[PDB]
């Protein structure tokens, strides 16, 4: 096997070996909760808390395409309620910036729509926004498809005006993938190529339940180590549906679970790699610069 032990220390030693050249990150809502964006998983602060004001037929409807097409207003009202006062990427986001700066980042596949990867300095070429993004929006009329930046979309969201296209007056929709919509072609094109040559999978802040994103962990070669940094031990096979990640069996050979906050796990990994000062300085500098432009 490629890891000398199934620990964070073993992953760090592998990362600094000649074998580890190309890292893929798979991230979800857990990497942005410390930036103030709720996940689904938390019962106290998660998205399903405080949804009865919207009078939905069922809670999940506000994230489903068929409901959005019938009544876009609840989703835009929720977007206003959750729009953050500042966009400060987390320690975890800036750990991925270090992977980019050091030439190790092949790709970040993200389920997040909050743009924080881009704010942290990942480029479009580095990213597969598997569920799209608020970064850009488009008129929904097939004959128009006028594009609008987030500055435009934010103003429509905060004035509580359902965004309409200035050219044709159709609805303007953030470039996100609702439940029930097809994922972007870029997701499948990158998935079919990137996982031929990946040396390490870093999975952070996701429960690995939404498909087809969750299936990405099975696309790596069988020898590729997989490190999960997450509050809970996600990605294991379900004992009923099985009739995945193998952290604990007698056959376990490549999967490591670090259970805790993504910011703390990334800091711990950075420290093992000799990057702790770099990461601390980067986060403090970037946050101070964001404040200086506010």
């Amino acid at each position: 096997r490629l890891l000398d032990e199934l620990t964070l220390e073993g992953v760090a030693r592998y990362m600094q070996s000649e074998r580890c050249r190309r890292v893929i990150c798979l991230v979800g809502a857990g990497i942005s909760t410390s930036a103030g964006i709720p996940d689904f998983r938390s019962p106290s602060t998660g998205l399903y808390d405080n949804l009865e004001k919207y009078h939905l037929p069922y809670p999940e409807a506000i994230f489903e395409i068929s409901y959005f097409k019938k009544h876009p207003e609840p989703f835009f009202a929720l977007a206003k309620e959750l729009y953050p006062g500042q966009f400060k990427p987390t320690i975890c986001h800036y750990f991925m910036r270090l992977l980019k700066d050091k030439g190790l980042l092949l790709r970040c596949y993200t389920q997040n729509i909050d743009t924080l990867e881009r704010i942290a300095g990942l480029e479009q070429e580095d990213l597969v926004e598997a569920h799209g993004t608020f970064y850009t929006s488009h008129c929904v009329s097939a004959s128009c498809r006028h594009e609008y930046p987030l500055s435009w979309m934010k103003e429509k969201i905060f004035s509580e005006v359902t965004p309409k296209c200035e050219d044709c007056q159709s609805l303007v929709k953030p470039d996100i993938v609702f439940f029930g919509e097809s994922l972007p072609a870029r997701f499948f094109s990158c998935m079919q190529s990137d996982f031929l040559k990946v040396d390490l999978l870093l999975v952070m802040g996701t429960s690995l339940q939404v498909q087809p994103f969750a299936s990405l962990i099975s696309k790596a070669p069988l020898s590729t180590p997989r490190l999960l940094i997450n509050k809970e031990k996600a990605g294991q096979s379900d004992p009923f549906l099985g009739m995945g990640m193998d952290f604990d069996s007698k056959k376990a050979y490549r999967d490591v679970a670090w259970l805790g906050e993504c910011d703390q796990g990334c800091l711990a990994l950075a420290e093992l790699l000799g990057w702790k000062k770099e990461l601390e300085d980067l986060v403090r500098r970037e946050h101070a610069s964001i404040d200086a432009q506010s």
Binding site: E60, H131, V177, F178, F179, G180, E181, S182, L183, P184, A185, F188, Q209, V210, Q211, P212
Partner: peptide, 7 residues
């Protein structure tokens, strides 16, 4: 149509 987002 490409595979769809599902929970």
């Amino acid at each position: 149509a490409l595979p769809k987002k599902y929970g």
